[model samples]
Target: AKIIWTRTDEAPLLATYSLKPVVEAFAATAGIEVETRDISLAGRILAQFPERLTEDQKVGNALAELGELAKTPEANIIKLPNISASVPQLKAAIKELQDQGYDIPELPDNATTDEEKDILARYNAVKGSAVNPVLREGNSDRRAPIAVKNFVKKFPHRMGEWSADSKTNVATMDANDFRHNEKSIILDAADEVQIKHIAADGTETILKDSLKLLEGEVLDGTVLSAKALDAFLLEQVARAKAEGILFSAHLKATMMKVSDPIIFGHVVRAYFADVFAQYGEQLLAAGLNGENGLAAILSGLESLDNGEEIKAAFEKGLEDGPDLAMVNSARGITNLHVPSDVIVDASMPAMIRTSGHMWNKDDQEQDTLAIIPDSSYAGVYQTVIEDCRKNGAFDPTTMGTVPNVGLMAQKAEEYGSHDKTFRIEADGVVQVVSSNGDVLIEHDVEANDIWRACQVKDAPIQDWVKLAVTRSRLSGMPAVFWLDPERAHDRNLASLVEKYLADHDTEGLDIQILSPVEATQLSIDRIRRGEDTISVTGNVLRDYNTDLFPILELGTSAKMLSVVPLMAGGGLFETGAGGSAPKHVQQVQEENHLRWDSLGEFLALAESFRHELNNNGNTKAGVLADALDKATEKLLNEEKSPSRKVGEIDNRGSHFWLTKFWADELAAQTEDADLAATFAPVAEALNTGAADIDAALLAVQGGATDLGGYYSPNEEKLTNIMRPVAQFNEIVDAL
Candidate 1:
């Protein structure tokens, strides 16, 4: 399974009509017809390899006779034989065969090993020149990162929509568009032009030298003036800074001096336009303010607590300074205008919203909410009420479980038609209208409230369905958390306004995470655009992430979410899923890792946004400040980066959105065993995580460490824990 980078054959990617052996068979299996009656295998192969020679053995001999010997003068009797005996005659034999157009493998003067022979054999076994993309990926690890980068760059828009089970981690152009637009900065920074280079006379010079161009790379390198660039960027940055630190102050970068105030003003306005458009949309959709209808409903529920005005915690959530209650609002509820399913995790008291995902409503799309049960309470809804009644202080994580919406109704239409009609009174009583339009009310039972009425209304024909959704059979229930529809709505908007702004910044930060190939590509882009005059500070990544934290970096902020790609990546797990897990996602990582959640995509967008923000800040889009904000918002809301084009969308019902880059592929060092053996001891000392060991084990087994002993830093032994941490020497790699 050695990785393949390129094909030696010069064949076209598409198959020829004549060579339909495999193609025809596949078509037959797929119920299609194919024919190759007028074609030959050789002709088909020759089509791919246009310069191939005829396979006839006598053709080589016939070519030799027509060589220099035929052209040589041999009039003298004694010199007549010289035509055949001379050095020129011997050379002609090989040259004549070569001139006829042959695809030949170059060989070394000496073959010293079987390995060498095998290498040559591989080189000689070319049936055709065309290569398969999948085969290329199989050998991807064997090639340079640039090979992969180049292939992706060449086919940026060619990939199919995101596939959850796709072997190759490729994202479609559509996915990228949505992902990039989610950012505020780069998405809107279109108008800003970074002064690529400033001249001695203070004029920005746009260099169009053919040799100096590299595709997409910024060309400014330590030279200050006379370089052509998107000049609005500097103007925008300067103008943005005047708005009382609208962006984070942690950004760091060298400032380019600009002389034109007119261009600068344009840049700032351009940057603002995108930012405002995106942020405004997010906030309006989720309106988490206290005045929201959704929040109002939730507030009413909390106030009518057990013989009291309100629950202490719920009241605190409303009054908290940092705004924890508002942050819990899910995006899809407001963005997609969809109903959210709320469930209580048995392991933790906190209620969780499982259905909401990042959604765009510009196309008038509806979001699907999948309210899943927390693992702690998985299939344990019946026991939750029993435990709560038996123990007065039952932990919600361990003692709260409710049937999800799935168990309530097989079709969503049922809820919309019947259950939605149920209404709750201010006194917390339940009332439901009959299918025939008659009203029924339950009185004097504290356990039966209006929220309960809504839950039970779905099951007018069946008692089991009602029982499943309504309060548990536990007597004298002291606390019940009614789903506050109004609060949920408000919370959704609040989250959009605050979190999206910060999340989009990660995109502006991602330019700094360039693998060697990406860095080279950036350099190439600078060269191609005639932007070589802009000085390239060697430390662009760090400087941009820290210093250029402007409106344009909003996409980078969203990308930051992938800091940990999988639960396995960082040994993380959810409640009920077991393995020392907390009861809920919000409980374990909300306070700590939550901010860094979307930063992965955000980091990728960082560089482009910074460049654009600086360039577009001085446009006539609107009031200078307003335009810059609007522009940044507009840009970031749409995802444009190739790497992060697919966030978590499941296109075609099979693919997980393009969020998971390292799905099947594992990171590694090299493909050499000797190199790995040499580096193993060093790796252990460097304290790499268990993930490295897992990947190494997959690469080669029985080399240095056994399956049980290879890379198990987290394993616990009976007598002593595996405490040693190791780092490999520079030589180890994937095999």
Candidate 2:
């Protein structure tokens, strides 16, 4: 009966209110209902503590209901970029909710009481890659839209030229990281498993007990050794100094919150080994957990008597150490300052695209060592780097497209199921035991070892394979499943992929499954030769490639068409990746300029309409969808996207132009006369007041505007501030 639109955080959330009015107004004419759901970080946090909230104040778990709907063909969800809140973000969201009169408790990191631990568990459930697995009941099909790709080609984004001799490269641990220590198996039957750690002195301890598992679920357990990790960090620091390149560590600290932050803190400690050795006890006494990162260390130091001495030691260490990569050298911010600052997916592609360099201490570009400790996905980056170095930067105008067929259905792999992940406390054999007490798989893990079990259900693997075939057949492009037989999980997946691949009519379809490294090289080589290839990968690589190719081909991932074909024949159209634009939100609150591009929304809406037409045979929706697509193309070609600067047309202004273009297209179309007549006058009204609307939107700029709060803003205040153009609002309202 309706489309479930998600209300998320930051820039996307702001964009939603600005465009929802226009979307609902247009959909109304077709008798299609558009409903809003709050799945924001603040909303999810509030939903967790419903008992403390009033009946009217309680927010249900909208994301869970939406996930159930995703299994039905009637599901038409436009999923936006939601906050996969980092620890800092989660704490901030909790504080904002508490300040708004909600009696929600913050995450108790050092919880001793049962009540505190319970509250911490509830908070942890909402943190770190929380939203995706719940809603994604289908594999991902993300690609740069044709219109956006063409637009980028015409107006190419500046790409830093690659030099053949550039020292910029990715360095990964040769041993003892998760990739090398991983062990995986498929459960022969449904089971309830227990993870135990048997210490070196023969003291057995249960890490986790009664983990419900299913038949044919692939379970992987691995560890990142603290000793090995420490050695690797030390080696990287020396190598960086020897090679005379800036030292930077990249990890998904936000998503891989539990494990990577520990890894990140190790790097920080190793780089400042002498300071930590001398004042480690003092730092710990000062409540400074390096795992919280260097920012926490620096902030915590201000209150201590020896803080100045420790600070001086830190400065001395930095001077003697390899030049650390600067996130913002002008502001004296180093990449090592925050664990989440240099996410590998965003940082690697950015470095690859921008002349194989990162900012140095001196605020100038230089070759850098991108230390990604885990070797799992590191080779893919190295491969791309080597290719770019060998053949020069790929020309967006001439380079072939890389559309991804990601295996992300039903919480398939690591990133999707962070709750199951654990950092081992004692040396032991971590076992996945059957309910019948039969050990299915085990890994020898040491104390302080980062270990986790991940599951990719057989159903999802089957679905993923089928999707790959369907896409390959439809596009007539070669589909390469990025599965590495060398890795345990992928080895199991490759077999299932091969088995399920036979289910479809893949005759004459160039479908092959290769390891991640092999697949990356093949795709890169094919791209360089100007040939299109479909990359079939699991969830994590899916997240990376979607951003990687789109950023390279279309200048930004915001314009990519991300569609998830629901298992029950419905569709979940995602509005591209980059979630919770904190910086963009800060700019809007500070300068009253919203540079959040709604092009992703426009693209997803058009696709959702088209899906409705295809599934339900709604002619009106189809006409609206086609007209919107045309409008989108026109919008891009005319360069009407939100500008980064304040004086230029921002998100609101862009929405104005989009509405005008959409209405004009609908009115001019001959396929639906009644629809055309309905939109004709609306188009004229928009045209007449276009100048006034632009002026009205611009009038509020260059000053601060209040929406009440950061995480959960006052809805009426946001609506008022976002829809400043009264005439335009009236026109939309009248429609």
Candidate 3:
């Protein structure tokens, strides 16, 4: 049997360099193969354009192969955190690949020619939430491992105090948003449908040619009015100004690449309406769009005529506008700088954890108006904020855990909305017309409106309901479905949920379907009383809650064990909910201080081992799995996690500790004498030479050494850099 370890982006990718060697060496002894598959942003991009690169530089499409494998029973994947690439991120990855002599083409601003169109089409497949929807053939089950939860109980992370009079609040459009305009329908039979726009001149413009669907598939269609969005954004700015609070915009721009980017641009345009009004034509001519964010626009202005004038106007806009939240105060990067700068999944929890405060340009924490354009799930954050104000910050020491059973399989909801989303150019009736001449869903759209549609198959929702009920029974906690009855999509889902839940033996279980806002309030109320709750939600809330609760409880979502129990009877193990660790790479390169914790990977490996043992009926692998758990618990008990500063035990040194602990656990266990005898020598060697090995790791610290590149690093250098201790290397290599 084999464990497919994914090689992904940033800190998590670099982490594999130090951790995988130990994993492979140990697993090889147990007769289990640990193989790697490249699913990095760079790898995905390169895979799409193999004809443009040399034979040696070409990469196999690991993601597609894994997607196919996920449909089979033997597929066991340890998926790592990968970047949900934005345009800026994609462009940077392309530039880096080109610099490495891979012969990759540039990502064009606008694809007019066939060559550029081909290039863009290829690039689009690699950008923004590309890897997730492919490999995820199962719903998500994310929670802290018992050891991780225990660690938090004893040595809790600090939670920021909340003030009763704090002006911090969430701002969302109450009308003319996606939620208010949403319509849903469930199909009775398999059908092929086409999404088309009927313009005033009796001409039909196809929005979607054909969306082949299955029986019992739930389809949701919605529209966000551009005019209403601008008004809402402008009002929020004025409110923030009046309240003397920082103005922040939180969105899943990278994940919902198509729809949210447009929303982000609208927010940018609204905040700087004066500047855009004055220089609108010139800025559009210079290929300046607010969706690219202020950073891209300002950088583009460097070479244009009257750029100084435009720059002055922008500065004037900032001066007249409300104080904007800062992404990086030291770097003078504001919330308006990049669409991906203020992601809601990460940022909202971070704000809540910090007592409803965000940093300003002065590098000081202050209250802020967190603007979330879509009304959907925005109430969840607002509810949590209200709780914080009422009960102060949650005590991580006493607060109850929130384990999420999320319906993410087959891209259940908004996760895959990018392709199906559109920005309307003319007033028309957007209709999802079936092949049988029936309009499934239709909306009257104005020019510049953002329209989105999504699909959810019956199988995944059925599985999700079963999982939620099972979790509720097992954990003995109330399971609340965060589905709004007012929402068209949720109403359809609620009917499905009610039907499927009847199939389960949920006699003693407390399971309730509540609206997003109601569920959040009930959850926080229970959490404050040290009562556990299971949040069973759709794909979006699954992403949101996993980060929200974990960050609040354990200081970071990086420690949570995220498992996807594939519908086809395999496993897809994920590292964490906090895939926002790109900054940690620079932290490592500059000072040899990788602040990223590999606790999530530790948990994933344990789960993967258990799966292999069950899947293959290998008792030997089971022995190793238990021992790994012991090692993980001890590693935490000893506080062997990576430090924020250099000179102490960083990520590499922490791995060394974990390796040593794992060996010790293997050798000490008596249930399997052969396994114990096998690891005894390795354990003894590690115990005897711990100091020397640690010193070797420490010697490399406080370095400015370049370990090659960022997107794809030089492997030989990376391997050597991560594995500096000869003693440790020899011990593991011999095993």
Candidate 4:
């Protein structure tokens, strides 16, 4: 079986330069073909408009091809975490592509021409949760691998202590929000639908022209009141100030690009109400957009006539508003710095891990008001915080795991909202109408409100239920679907979940459905008691819960085994739960070190090999998988993963160690004598040259280095930089 490996962006891309070669070298010995696909943000941009670029500059569309391959049983993919680009990030990638002699249009915010409109649509498809929804042709099954889980139990990392009187809490809109206004329906047959907005003047505007639905598919719609959200932000800001708490907003602005950025912009305006009241007109006139974050606004102020005064007002507003939570206290960077800086999945769990507190401007830890504008999954964080407040911090030494079974295939739930979401222009009603002229779902909205429609096909949900049941039976743990009975979408989903549960043999397996808050309560309490449980949730909660529980249980979510068993009987393995950090890239260029851990890649590759073994009946692939697991176990026991400083064994050293131990494992195994004989001398050479290999790696640190570029690096420079110690390389080629 052939494996498709993704070449993504940032630190993951840099780490791949070292690890992919090792993977390819080892796979070739087993007669396996491992193909590298360019799915990076820069790659996608270059692929979108091939006609505009010169002949050599044009790139292949790997993401588009993979989307088709995922439906076939031959699909074996190793997907890594990629940048879900916001508007600003999309422009950055575009600029990077242009700088490298490829001509691409600038991201058009206010397009008036037909050419610009097409460009906007193409860029929208490339950015913001673009890859996952396309390639995930199956439901998700994510958990810690057995070897990694046991190693963590023996040698655990430190978790933060939660204070008894910790005031850090979540604030969400109680009414006039997405949750309160959701409407859903189950289609009985296939139908072509259209999304329309009817103005108060009785004129109709088409939001989306066509969306073909299948039988038994669930369609949902919801709206958030702009007026209500602004009011909530104002109340939360004053409350944070009155209670002396740090104020911070959490959102998945990169994924929910169209909607949440608008909310984030409003949150910024709400905090600096006085400043915006005075300079709002001038700032807008000068092309300063609050939706782009305060950094954009402050920099744009430099181009204005009264720019210095506006900048001064921003300085005064910093103190006059609440003590905002800082993303980097040393750099004096606040959480409101950028839309991509503080993602809700990564940010909220991080806050929970650190004594339920965030850093203030003076670098002191303080309780914060966590403002999540939407009420959908905000209660899950609030529920966890309340649990921590009463029961103190979770002990990583003995806490049982809460692995997730997420129904994320076919862009289930909120992931499908990027294109369908819209901000209202006039007082009107947005309606999703069928081709037969019947309204399937509709919402009354006012000017500035956000309206969105979501879809979930019948087959993915059925597959999700079967996977959840199978997981519970195999692990002997109770499974809970974190579905709220009061929620319009979840209520409809619970009925179909009940129907799908009947298709499986769940005689002894325990499965239940509860609201998000209650499920969080039960799951957290059970895990604290050292009892394992499974969280069966939609895409949004799946993203949130996996991070929340894993960070508390294992001190890092990066170790989870995210395997997606394809609906067509294939496997799509994903690496790491964390974002691709640009700071990690900076460390590589500045200090000649990469602390980016590739443990996720190691875990996923083992599963990918085993998948090849099962699908193609290759016993050598079986042997490879078994040996790799044993090698990973030893590497974990020896604590050879990358560390937090320079001159230590970094990503490259970690790759060497994995290769060394894997060769040792293969040579020691007696089941495959020929395979063992082939690696015996290779293992011997590695053992003899361990000292030189490690020394050669350490010599390159404590100095400045150059990677070719940020988004698109030079290939030859990458190879020379990644393989610094040639002795290890020489021995590997001896195979």
Candidate 5:
């Protein structure tokens, strides 16, 4: 069987050129093929505009096809982190493609012509958290490998010291956010539903005409109260000022593209209420939408007639407003600069790991008031921060790991809300009307309130609960489902979880469901007491917790082994949570140094091979997989991973060391004598040329190199630059 290795973006893409060759050559020994499909940012773009491209230039809809394939048992996808491109990143990819002579149209905020609208729609579909949901047709099983966890225990990542009196804390809405106001219903049957918004003045608007849903799918429609949210933000601002802590708002605007950005806009507008109240109409007339955040407003002001005055008011608002957290105060970048800049999943964990503080105006770490508008998962972070305050920082060496069993199959929960989310335009009752003209669900929403609908199929939920039980039994650790029954959606899921869990022989398994706050508290309690626990969560929390625990334990989430056991009996091995490192890519082009660690890839590859062995009965593959595992442990023990500084061993050098160690381990092993012999000569050749390989990889350091392009660099150019060590390449090629 062939492993569908995905060619993704940035640092991973660069590593692919060096690593794929080795994987293919090695896998070939076991009669297994490693086939690569282009799922890069440029490839996705080119796929979107196939009609404009020549036959040779055209690329298939690999992502869409993979989504379908993920439903089949034959699927074996080693999924890498692709660019969940923000608006700016998407536009840059488009321009790069356009410059490369691809006739893809530029994406516009508002499209007037049919051609432009078509282009915009296509572009929007491919942007922000696009890749994962499409490919994740299974529940998530993410954990740090034994080797990695052992490595961390031996050399624990640095943890910031916490104080009982630290003013840093997470503040969320007391009520009227998405959680308290949600209404969920299981669809009686497969039906098409219409979303209609009926205004207070008897005006009706068809928000959505035909939303197709499946039978037994739990649908949740929720609204955030505009007035309540504004009040909450204002209160946090005043509270932050009184407490003298840095004030920062965290939201997943790029992923929850429609709603959170609007929420972010409200925070910006509320902070600059004095300025907006005076120049609201002028700013609106100049197309200064707060959804784009404060940076866009400032840029738009430069084109307005009373630009200088409005700019002065904005500057005054900053001075008079609460002490806002600085993204980069030296560069005049504020926390409210761009909606995507400070993502919640990445930022909150970072703040928690770093003394629960964020940078302030003077570039000093200060306690912060982290304002998360929605209360859904906000309590989780607050619980952790409170735990740290009560009992100092967690010791990585003694603390137990918190593995995650995430329910993300078939676009579960808010992670799938990009298309369903809406910002309300008028006070109305938003109803999900069935095709039979019956109202399935209704939500009372006011103007500027965000409303969205999400569905989780029964099959995935059942599979998720089973996976949780399986993980619990295997680890002998207590499993807690972070489900708040007080919320409408979780209430529906909780009942189903209880029902399905009984379907298995869970005699000795310790499994229970708790609200996000309760479960977070319990998990932290266990961690502090040196006990391990499994966090059984939905898609969003799955994304959150995996990063949250790993950063605290291993200093980076990139070391975790992410495996998605496809509900259809396949496997999707995910290569870490660290996104495409655009900054690292820039460094490689400028200084020819790649600090991107391929540890995640190494872990995933071994797991993928083992999974293939179980499915296809490849004994030799299993041998290779086991040897690679030992080799990885050896590499870590030898400290051969990539370094940040130039002239030090980079990604290529790490790959060299890994290859040598893997071959050496294979030759020394007794499992599968044929496989051992296959690697003996290769191992001898690598050991003999080790010094030359190291010198060759390090020789080009501190020099400028070209990658040809950013999004889709010429493959040949990347191979030449990445595989600079000739003897190492020749030895691997000979295998």
Candidate 6:
């Protein structure tokens, strides 16, 4: 047992010598690994290793850094200065090094040797030893790209370059500057567009693919397989580490000043704090429908606080519990695709109110830390003030003017004098400007806050839709726009839409539109029950008068599909590589459809179970029927297959094949044979149940009583089975 002392900071050399004996003594005394962290490495060690009793280097730590350093030594060298290396240029240098068979060091530290110097001498000879090196690989001493660039600048002098007055020198300046700026601008713009496209497409494509799957396929996003995903993650983490993205000298310095354990503790807690801040409010409301509410939760927490009642009906969360409603609300906000700046309003008035249930009759306290006020502050409270002070994560230097709620309100204020225009305030409220500056649309909520009332009213502002419509016209095609509630407001969306419609009305133009149906109070009520007004395929494609209309936005969904593969792209199959990738993609598509088909089958089985439950209505079997109904309800409320959201529990992959098999069993139960042998009354009742369900489904687009489950005519629902269109309504008759 070794006793370890943990502290932050780079301990002086004297401290290291002094602490050795102490650690050695403690190791003898405690029978544990005895170690100590000095000031400099303290923070880094703490953040990375929270459980370490002492901040000390383990055997493998430096080896890990060296391994990462070897990945792109030249790139890091260049990043050290104000320049970067061209891909082709770096590839050329790396290729040369590889061809030379130079011994690159595997260890970053402890490279002070003649053998190391010889290897580095070879690397530096060709690399141009005009500048000092910052990194060493295996035996090769690697210099930063900045040093190389500097060397190049001086190379003209050494190589006797033409004078600045010469055309060659002048041309170099003009050509290099133009090329650098041009490439920089193009790459930056491309990155902006690519990020947005990837995020949106990832969501859209995944959902579309999920909905297209049939039975007997994997439903987990494990479509790529664990090995592939692991490989991908390994590459990503390696890239990030090599790029010095996760660590920096400044961070190391900060870590040294504070105890790493404390810093790590705070950093980890801060991350959780922020996440909780974002999702807490929503998670809280999710549990409301269950037997527990605020009081019960409070009681549970009190018991947990005192270390009692650990096994009670409810358990308190280890950390702050978030409200589910808020999380969903935040997600809706995210969907709007609004810029972050517009979402963070600065000049909004804060509003607060307390109910009798939350306060006692004698409640009168100061509105400070550990103090409760008789009423919360209304005019720019502390919360509002701190929010105003905090800066967002956007790189303003690179990406300019990404709008937030504050910026949007400021911009919207341009319309304040216009009597016909809507005026947006700080707390996300939309006010219609009447003649003489009179306010309309009665809610007094803050300008940038998210509230359904602002949009689901007699008249919505439609700001985002209006912008999208304008952009569509500008682009000479209908634009696909989404509102990012994370950054923008619904009123802005309403205002945008209203503006577009107003323009269309004046021009007498028939603008084809895809807009959200106004959410009513009932919709909000349903959302509380974990139901969203996500449209099915029938509404998206078939109702749009065939699949001719361009798709705009897909509604949020609970049920999603994931795919699994049956074979590897390359193996003993020794397949031609030409079409191998696409072939793999095709197999994924087929299996995906199979999984979706299985989901429908599951729904069919549930329907059958419900019937059995109905027959035993008077007994415990009837109770089981209720339980079955509840189970189905639970499944519906649970996150559906193939959702990108993390922490989902339903695991559609597990259910895919089972559901299909169960559907088959239910179909077998209703076969003319099983029903014929059962008690005649029971058989008759079961047949009637099956017939009623089949009939109800038939009224729907693809609802048929055949071996296949309820089939909607929606393209997403279509499987290999082809039913004649002319007999669509006579689906049962055809069966």
Model 1 lDDT tens row, 1-735: 000011110011011111122222212221233332111122222332233455552222211221222222210000000011123322332243344344532332356788657544443332222121101110000001111222223333121122222111101122111111111111111121221122333443322111111222111111111111123233323332342111101100112112112122222222333332333343223332112223332344433333122234333422321111121234313201111111112111111111111112232211121111111111122222222233222221111111111111221111221222212112222222223333222222121111111111112212212211121221111111111112222122223223332433222221121222233233323333322111111111212221111101111111121110111111000001011111211221122111112112112122212222233331211121222222223223333111211222111001011111111111122333433343344334223433453343223211222111111111232001111112221212111
lDDT of 4 by residue, 644-678 (tens): 79999998999899999999999999888988988
The TM-score of predicted model 5 comes to 0.86
List the candidates' TM-scores in order: 0.16, 0.81, 0.81, 0.80, 0.86, 0.17
Candidate 5 weakest ten by summed lDDT: 281-290
> lDDT for each of the candidates?
0.21, 0.86, 0.89, 0.88, 0.88, 0.22
lDDT of 6: 0.22
Q: C-alpha displacement of 216 in model 1, angstroms?
A: 66
Best-to-worst ranking by lDDT: 3, 4, 5, 2, 6, 1
lDDT of 5 by residue, 1-735 (tens): 888899999999999999999988998998889989888888888888889998888888998888888888888889887798889988888898889888888888899999888889999888888887778778889986878988888999888899999999889998898898899999869999989999998787988888888898999998899999999988898898898998899999877878888898888988888887999887877778678989999998889888999999999998888788888888888899888889998899899888888998898999999999999999899999999998988899988889999988877888787788888988878999989989888888898888888888989999999889878986799999999978999999999998898899999888999999999888888887788899999999998998899898888886789898887878899987768888999889989999988988889999888877877788888998988999899889989999999999999999989999999989999977888899999999999889988998888889788888999798789989988877888888887
- In model 4, where is the ten-residue run with the lowest total lDDT? 281-290
lDDT of 4 at 302: 81
Per-prediction tally of clashes:
189, 0, 0, 0, 0, 96
RMSD for each model, in Å, please? 33.7, 5.1, 5.2, 5.3, 4.2, 32.7
Cα deviation of 259, candidate 3, in Å: 2.5
Kindly indicate the candidate among 3 and 6 with the higher TM-score. Answer: 3
> Model 2, stretches more than 4 Å misplaced?
7-18, 28-31, 37-68, 80-134, 272-316, 330-333, 416-428, 473-476, 576-596, 617-622, 642-653, 667-735
Question: How many residue pairs of model 1 clash at the backbone?
Answer: 189
Clash list (residue pairs), candidate 3: none
